[PDB]
Amino acid sequence: VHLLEQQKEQLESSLQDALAKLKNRDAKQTVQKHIDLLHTYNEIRDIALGMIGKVAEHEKCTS
Amino acid sequence: EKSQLESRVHLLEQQKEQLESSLQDALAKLKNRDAKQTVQKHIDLLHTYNEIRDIALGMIGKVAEH
Amino acid sequence: HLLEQQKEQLESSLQDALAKLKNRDAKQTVQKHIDLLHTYNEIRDIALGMIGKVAEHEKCTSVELFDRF
Amino acid sequence: EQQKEQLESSLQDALAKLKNRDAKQTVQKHIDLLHTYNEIRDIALGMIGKVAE
């Protein structure tokens, strides 16, 4: 029963590879979504600093 | 001649008086509405500075959290 | 989740601030114009007033030259 | 008034910065939709290749 066992090995792997490939894409997409969210945040933070800076330099030229 | 030229000279003096009161009063009504407009630039800029200040704080209150 | 929660409340708040600030410059532009119109009407009225009086003076002189010459 | 430039502009730059971020994120969302579906088509065929075989 070599064809019987060679056949089943083919079957188990095609499921397992399918899963391995689907798991490793989401590994990559998720880490990537995180990084992308970090940069989105550094940016809106730097917008805040920016805006508070210009408010402080407006403030220090009246009384 | 002399009666009537004393009419004309009077008249003119009366006219000079009105013309100065007019230039006077135009310059007033102007300057005033000029002032009113400068107060308004200032108040509008106050409203703007607060709006942008409040959104700035908001962000700095939030980037505090994260 | 709040990628989108805090980004959109910000963006709304910005576009609004800008709306408001732009509305304020516009209101006060029509006001510059309304005021220029007020000043022009006044200067005009006066200047043409002076012109009428000198008009009347010129009529007198002329009437004098005629009843004379 | 030069102050009003500063402030207005600080709003206009904030909006600009993050209307653009979206633009770019949005094009990219599209490209990923396409690429992912090509990975799914291929996994599918992988299995079907090594089953019917």
Ligand SMILES: CCCCCCCCO[C@@H]1O[C@H](CO)[C@@H](O)[C@H](O)[C@H]1O
């Ligand atoms: C009835 C009159 C009320 C006057 C209110 C004026 C408030 C204007 O507000 C402020 O005026 C300061 C000085 O002119 C400026 O330095 C500031 O930039 C301006 O925002």
Ligand SMILES: CCCCCCCCO[C@@H]1O[C@H](CO)[C@@H](O)[C@H](O)[C@H]1O
């Ligand atoms: C591990 C190395 C990762 C490198 C970090 C990437 C640097 C940020 O590059 C990013 O590209 C984005 C694409 O959506 C643009 O939207 C942004 O403008 C920008 O911050």
